[PDB]
Amino acid sequence: PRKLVPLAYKQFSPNVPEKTLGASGRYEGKIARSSERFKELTPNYNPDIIFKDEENTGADRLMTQRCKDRLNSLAISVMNQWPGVKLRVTKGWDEDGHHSEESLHYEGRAVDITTSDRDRNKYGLLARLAVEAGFDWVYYESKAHVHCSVKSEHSAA
Ligand SMILES: [Zn+2]
Numbered sequence: 001p002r003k004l005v006p007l008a009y010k011q012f013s014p015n016v017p018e019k020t021l022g023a024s025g026r027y028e029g030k031i032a033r034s035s036e037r038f039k040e041l042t043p044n045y046n047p048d049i050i051f052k053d054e055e056n057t058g059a060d061r062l063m064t065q066r067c068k069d070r071l072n073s074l075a076i077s078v079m080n081q082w083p084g085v086k087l088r089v090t091k092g093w094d095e096d097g098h099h100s101e102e103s104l105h106y107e108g109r110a111v112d113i114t115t116s117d118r119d120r121n122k123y124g125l126l127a128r129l130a131v132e133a134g135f136d137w138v139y140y141e142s143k144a145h146v147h148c149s150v151k152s153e154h155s156a157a
Contacts, residue, residue, distance in 0.1 A: 004132070006124030007146075012139040013131045019102070023137040024109065024149040027102035032095065040152075041093065041108045044068050048075045050088040050116050060092035063108045066150045071111060074133035074148075078115065081129060086116040090145050110149040112141070120144065 007013060016022050031037045041062040044051075049071065051060045063071070071087070078087040091112040094105040104110035113130065115122045120143055127146040130138045135148040 004125065004128050007127035007131075007138065007140045008124060009140055009143065011127075012137065013127075014137070018104070018137045018139070018149060021155065023151075024104060025136075025151040025155050027104065028107055028152055028154060030106040031093070031108055037107070040064055042068060044071060046072055046075055048079060048086055050086050051092070052088065052090045054091075055096070057095065059095050060089050060111075062093045063111065064150065064152065066153065067109055067111065070130075070133050070135045070148070070150055074113075074130055074135070077129045077133055078126065081125065082115065082117075082122065085122075088114045088116045088118075090114055104149045107152075109152060110147060112145040112147050114145055 014023055018024050019026055031040060042065055043061045044063055053060050075087040078085060089111045093108040099105045113126065115126055123146055124140060127138050127140045130146060130148045136151045137149045139147040141147040
């Protein structure tokens with residue numbers, strides 16, 4: 001077994017920029033509800049994940065299949081790591097311009113996460129679990145959340 005080392009505040013893994021091929025790849029443009037690319041998004045209703053849904057639109061649940069798959073893996077590992085605690089998404093797909101100009105939040109490929117108990121002391125380890133779950137980039141971006149993203153299916157030729 002490998003020793004699990006939490007990420008430190010502001011650390012990202014892998015240790016390269018988010019939008020490189022070694023990580024989550026390119027920004028492919030905002031997805032709006034009216035977009036053809038809205039069909040890239042699938043609603044995640046995993047009962048073992050809490051969604052903050054601050055906008056009251058369900059947008060946090062709408063994500064690409066790869067994002068869903070990694071999130072669902074992470075949900076198992078979070079409950080393994082801290083029995084009685086669940087994975088929580090505090091921000092997923094952004095319909096409303098609240099991130100930097102080319103954020104993967106705009107295309108349903110990034111989620112900001114916490115544990116369900118909002119114990120900030122758990123977040124460094126949560127970030128390491130997100131790496132182990134196969135997220136393509138994980139960034140301990142603020143004391144309040146870990147930013148996790150995935151590559152798209154559009155760069156493999
Ligand atoms: Zn984020």
